[PDB]
Design a protein around this nucleic acid. Structure first.
Length: 1190
DNA sequence: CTATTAGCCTCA
């Protein structure tokens, strides 16, 4: 063997095969994106290819070209530069597809001709083939080695000294030797897995430090054979084939486990059937474990209280990012007094658990009759959760709720889980360049497990290693993006926020205790894909329905377009036309006389009754016949009659047609031994109809994936090409997802003359035909379900409901009602009924029909006639398709055209409903967020972040009141309106948020526009306009379809618009303004100082003459607090745009006029006239005079 | 107080 890299010197890198029209479509947008964006950037190419035209071949050609380019590039640099190789992947969901793709790639490597001459020599082929690895699961991995290989590994490492390992190997080898029956293979697989778990563990244990066994010669080859992932690390190979489940786990090498998700720079991924990966990623997310919310609190509070005294090298600036966590923990623990245990006070009220659910933004649903509160009792020394007094009023509780405690515990846990990523990132930052203690090169992936293990070690929290690994990376990838906070100043969405679920059931072990379980979902598959693209990976997805219009059975492409932007590449019209021309050229139906017939059939009762009476003539009634001989009950009569009649009519219609040989009837249930009576009835009918004509028919029942893997699909192939007749196959929609390629060999002797080829050019390979008659039934339940545990199904259902609400297919009222009904127990029937009223159902049904139709037919030998039978319930759904028919299959368009001819149909646009629902949701979220922020601002001391948030919101609303383009950062402050610049609404901003009406539905409601806020009259002032120009505020409203929500037009805009006006007017007459000293924030406008006078004057401003229900003790409390904290002082109450003809009242602490000398509050009616835009010098003159000795 | 079920890969 002389396989070396240097061999490729004498080989021309200029001859290429003929570029197909399907090839430039992949290379051109990539080049455009490279020249527009940077060299190191991500992308996403949803390629809508079609079955039977070639999708795997093009991807394999692309992979081969990339490998050749890498090999070419590696030779040039040689010595002047050393780095790693590019990584390339091929990921799917099925093992058979993986092995078939690898075999096809290898075969393509062997055989390839340019101008009738082999492209590569034998040594070149060997070198290329020595670069691809395949990584199956561990248990199957152990069953491909040999005795000599594993013996060599054991002897080289000096492991043939313990009797246990050798005994286990001998037992496994013997059991493998004698293993033919199907009930011992499971034990063999389990034993192989458990042996592989310990072996690689020992190999890593020995060599992760001293006494490193050198690898060379044949021992290196043996270790590489046993560990395919070892070849990648050293640099031997840089191409991998694996499944999606393995991709999210990683593969082992001699040092540790390498996770592909954690190092994706300069990598290329190829995923086929990309739309189906949504459910796989959802299952992987939902398979997570739960966690009791009070055991970890105790462990974290007790084991982190005090530590030892040892800094040591390596560690540097790790404790600095942990002190705030302890500060928060102590503050949280010294409020509820969590040291005490938990109990409940109720008179036999623990039969059933109180579930608690939350969305973390604006949705909160509980299944308790009355709200529960938490209290601390100093008598019994225990914390209790109780409903307290049931009497009306009597000092109703307002301190807090259990939901608040749950949310606080959850946010504490999330913050703890999140700080470790930054700590480890800083640790690798100092290690890499700031330490250089050991010469190892490597990246974050190399020194990852050691750091987390050591830290779990330093603070000893080992029982948390599994909890922290799931959500560990360099930065994010599983939690939020951008601002990394759930605030109004950052982009908000469900796809990177998640949900929460908490249950309170009875606690066993100790009867006088309660438990609090929790399940989490930190992200959604769309967010995961977005993070993968952002990290710097080029993703290329191949599928035929990659851009479906559903969020249950597909990715949410509306969210990806608002986060990626220019990195989501799309094709133009010319490229689609070229693809369309290629597909017609390769499959031409407007020639050779190929025709399709489509027929919708209904249900009949005389037909079935006559057939039943002919079946058993000894009986008197059909009801007795069905109740006695068949297994159906009294309830199941109409449904069985309908579907059986439809199937029998379709079968009879097919049998009547002479020139046909194949039939596949897609159904929704499997026809097995459980339905033997119905099978016998169908067989009798088939025999009768075969006798009526002159044909021989053979029927196949119970065709499952198990039947495919036990008997095989080749039985039909032999039966079709040896004996003349007709074949009928019974199967299911889901069954034809694991068994592919339903073809068979042809025979010109047995077949007639109707085998016309459809391709316009000569066709290579063998001769094969496909199905020429199919029966389609209306699909049933399309709500995803999980059968792993009890919590996974509930998590899936809540995720589906939240996604449906977020997309815009559900109003907040309907979503809340559905969540409440599901939380407290629901049946599948009610869930399906609720789901049937949306617009996603029709899209899902249409996608299912298109996928089912497309998979039938992969050859060029089509019969003269093809018959299609469709259920009568699909007419309305298939009659409402209005996309463009450019990439449609030749049979789906026929269905649409036939269904559309049934009269004229009224179609209601989804847009109007989407805009209405989104406006409602935005208004509700704004209301709740503003209320929460205002409540937070009133708890002294006020945080710095809250003040920054408030100021940024006010400044953004002042500067830009109408944005032309869709905002990205300040997202949920605007709503899209049909009219530009103004809109109408109707609601009360004191009650139920989901009771608002918008736009055309109310023509006599309140108005939000520029003419209502009185902007022009204010702007005309000569003392205010220069201020507005200096600060850059808007002097007029632009005309675009993005306006602020009604909540922001009344409680935010008016106040600022008045405040700046009064400040600008008053600042000229020797007045200065300051900021509130953080103690009474939001209770007053500014602080006023002038001429160095005692008792500093506070200012309060309002925009217009607003009367509110504030005559209660709120004003007295405010004035008392100000007087206590600052002594005697003076206060100014100012309005704007009123009447400059009303005198000035002198007020005491209350609003009753008193003596001018003994006065503290000034009520100034107005300063700027609303008629000619004048001002009021007399008012300010009297103001200045009043500040004197009086 | 309505609709009407089959398939899957990985590891503690």
């Amino acid at each position: 063997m002389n396989v070396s890299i240097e061999e490729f010197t004498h080989f021309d890198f200029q001859l290429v095969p003929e570029p197909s029209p399907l090839d430039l479509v992949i290379t051109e947008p990539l080049k455009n994106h490279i020249e527009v964006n940077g060299v190191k950037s991500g992308a996403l190419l949803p390629l809508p290819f079609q079955t039977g035209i070639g999708k795997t071949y093009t991807a394999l050609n692309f992979l081969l070209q990339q490998m050749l380019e890498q090999v070419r590039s590696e030779l040039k640099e040689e010595n002047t530069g050393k780095k790693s190789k590019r990584l390339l992947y091929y990921v799917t969901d099925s093992v058979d597809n993986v092995v078939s793709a690898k075999a096809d790639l290898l075969k393509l490597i062997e055989k390839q001709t340019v101008k009738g001459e082999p492209r590569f020599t034998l040594e070149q082929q060997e070198y290329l083939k020595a670069q691809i690895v395949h990584l199956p699961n561990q248990s199957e991995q152990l069953l491909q080695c040999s005795d000599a290989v594993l013996n060599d590994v054991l002897i080289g490492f000096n492991l043939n000294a313990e009797r246990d390992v050798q005994a286990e190997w001998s037992a496994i080898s013997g059991l493998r030797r004698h293993a033919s029956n199907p009930e011992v293979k499971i034990s063999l697989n389990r034993q192989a897995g458990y042996f592989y778990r310990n072996l690689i563990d020992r190999l890593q244990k020995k060599q992760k430090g001293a006494d490193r066994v050198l690898l060379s010669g044949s021992l290196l080859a043996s270790v590489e054979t046993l560990l395919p992932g070892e070849k990648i690390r050293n640099g031997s190979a840089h191409v991998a084939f694996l499944t999606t489940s393995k991709f999210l786990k990683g593969f082992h090498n001699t040092r540790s486990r390498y996770s592909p998700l954690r190092d994706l720079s300069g990598a290329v991924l190829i995923i086929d059937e990309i739309d189906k990966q949504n459910q796989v990623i959802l299952s992987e997310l939902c398979k997570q474990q739960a966690q009791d919310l009070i055991w970890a609190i105790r462990t974290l509070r007790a084991n982190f209280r005090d530590h030892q005294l040892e800094s040591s090298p390596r560690y540097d600036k790790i404790e600095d990012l942990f002190e705030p966590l302890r500060e928060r923990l102590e503050e949280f623990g010294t409020n509820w007094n969590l040291a005490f245990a938990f109990n409940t006070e109720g008179a036999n009220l623990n039969e059933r658990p109180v579930r608690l659910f939350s969305d973390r933004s604006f949705t909160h649903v509980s299944s308790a009759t009355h709200k529960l509160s938490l209290k601390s009792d100093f008598l019994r020394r225990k914390n209790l959760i109780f409903s307290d007094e049931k009497v009306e009023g009597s000092l109703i509780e307002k301190h807090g709720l259990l939901t608040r405690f749950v949310n606080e515990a959850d946010v504490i846990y999330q913050w703890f889980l999140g700080t470790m990523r930054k700590a480890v990132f800083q640790y690798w930052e100092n290690v890499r360049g700031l330490e250089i203690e050991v010469r190892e090169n490597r990246s974050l992936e190399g020194t990852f497990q050691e750091a987390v293990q050591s830290l779990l070690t330093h603070f000893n929290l080992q029982e948390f290693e599994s909890a922290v690994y799931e959500s560990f990376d360099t930065r994010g990838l599983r939690q939020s993006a951008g601002g990394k906070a759930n605030k109004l100043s950052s982009s908000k969405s469900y796809h990177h926020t998640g949900l929460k679920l908490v249950e309170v059931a009875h606690n066993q072990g100790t009867r006088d205790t309660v438990n609090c379980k929790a399940s989490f979902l930190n992200t959604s598959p769309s967010g995961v894909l977005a993070d993968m693209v952002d990290a710097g990976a080029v993703i290329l997805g191949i599928s035929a329905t990659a851009r479906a219009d559903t969020v249950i059975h597909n990715f949410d492409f509306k969210y990806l377009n608002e986060r990626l932007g220019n990195k989501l590449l799309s094709l133009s019209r010319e490229q689609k036309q070229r693809v369309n021309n290629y597909y017609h050229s390769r499959r031409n139906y407007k020639d050779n006389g190929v025709v399709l017939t489509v027929k919708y059939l209904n249900s009949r009762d005389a037909f079935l009754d006559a057939l039943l009476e002919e079946y058993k003539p000894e009986a008197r009634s059909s009801h007795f016949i069905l109740n006695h001989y068949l297994g159906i009950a009294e309830s199941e009569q109409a449904f069985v009659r309908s579907w059986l009649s439809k199937l029998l009519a379709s079968i009879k219609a097919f049998i009547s047609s002479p020139d046909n040989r194949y039939m596949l009837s897609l159904l929704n249930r499997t026809l097995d031994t459980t339905r033997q009576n119905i099978n016998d009835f169908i067989q009798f009918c088939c025999d009768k109809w075969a006798k009526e004509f002159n044909v021989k028919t053979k029927t196949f029942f119970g065709v499952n994936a198990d039947w495919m893997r036990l008997v095989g699909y080749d039985e039909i192939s032999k039966h079709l090409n040896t004996e003349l007749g007709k074949v009928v196959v019974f199967s299911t929609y889901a069954s034809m997802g694991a068994g592919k390629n339903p073809d068979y060999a042809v025979n010109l002797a047995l077949e007639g003359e109707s085998l016309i080829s459809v391709a316009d050019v000569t066709y290579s390979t063998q001769l094969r035909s496909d199905i020429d008659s199919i029966y389609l039934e209306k699909p049933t339940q399309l709500l995803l379900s999980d059968d792993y545990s009890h919590t996974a199904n509930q998590l899936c259902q809540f995720h589906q409901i939240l996604s449906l609400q977020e997309n815009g297919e559900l109003s907040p009222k309907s979503a809340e009602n559905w969540c409440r009904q599901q939380l407290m127990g629901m049946s599948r029937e009610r869930s399906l009924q609720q789901y049937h009223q949306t617009s996603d159902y029709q899209s899902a049904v249409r996608k299912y029909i298109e996928q089912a139709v497309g998979r039938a037919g992969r050859t060029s030998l089509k019969r003269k006639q093809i018959l299609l039978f469709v259920d009568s319930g699909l007419k309305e759904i298939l009659a409402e398709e209005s996309r463009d028919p450019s990439l449609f299959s030749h049979e789906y368009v026929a269905l649409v055209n036939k269904a559309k001819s049934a009269g004229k149909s009224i179609v209601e646009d989804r847009a109007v409903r989407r805009l209405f629902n989104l406006a409602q949701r935005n208004n509700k979220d704004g209301m709740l967020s503003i209320k929460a922020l205002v409540h937070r601002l009133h708890n002294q001391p006020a945080s710095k972040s809250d003040i920054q948030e408030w100021q940024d919101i006010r400044t953004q609303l002042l500067r830009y009141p109408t944005v032309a383009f869709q905002p990205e950062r300040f997202n949920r402050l605007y709503l899209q309106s049909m009219t530009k610049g103004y809109y109408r609404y109707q609601g009360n901003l004191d009650g139920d948020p989901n009771s608002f009406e918008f736009f055309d539905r109310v023509p006599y409601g309140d108005m939000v526009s520029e003419e209502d806020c009185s902007l022009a009259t204010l702007v005309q002032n000569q003392y205010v306009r220069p201020w507005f120009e200096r600060k850059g505020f808007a002097c007029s409203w632009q005309k675009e379809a993005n306006v602020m929500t009604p909540i922001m037009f009344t409680n935010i805009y008016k106040g600022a618009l008045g405040e700046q006006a009064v400040e600008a007017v008053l600042t000229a007459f020797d007045f200065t303004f300051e900021e509130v000293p953080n103690s009474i924030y939001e209770r007053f406008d500014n602080r006023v100082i002038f001429a160095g006078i005692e008792q500093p004057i506070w200012l309060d401003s309002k925009y217009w003459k607003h009367e509110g229900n504030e005559s209660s003790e709120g004003y007295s409390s405010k004035i008392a607090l100000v007087e206590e904290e600052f002594g005697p002082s003076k206060f100014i109450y100012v309005n704007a745009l009123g009447d400059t003809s009303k005198p000035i009242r002198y007020l005491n602490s209350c609003f009753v006029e008193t003596s001018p000398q003994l006065a503290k509050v000034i009520e100034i009616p107005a300063l700027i006239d609303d008629s000619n835009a004048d001002t009021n010098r007399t008012a300010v003159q009297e103001l200045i005079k009043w500040l004197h000795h009086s």
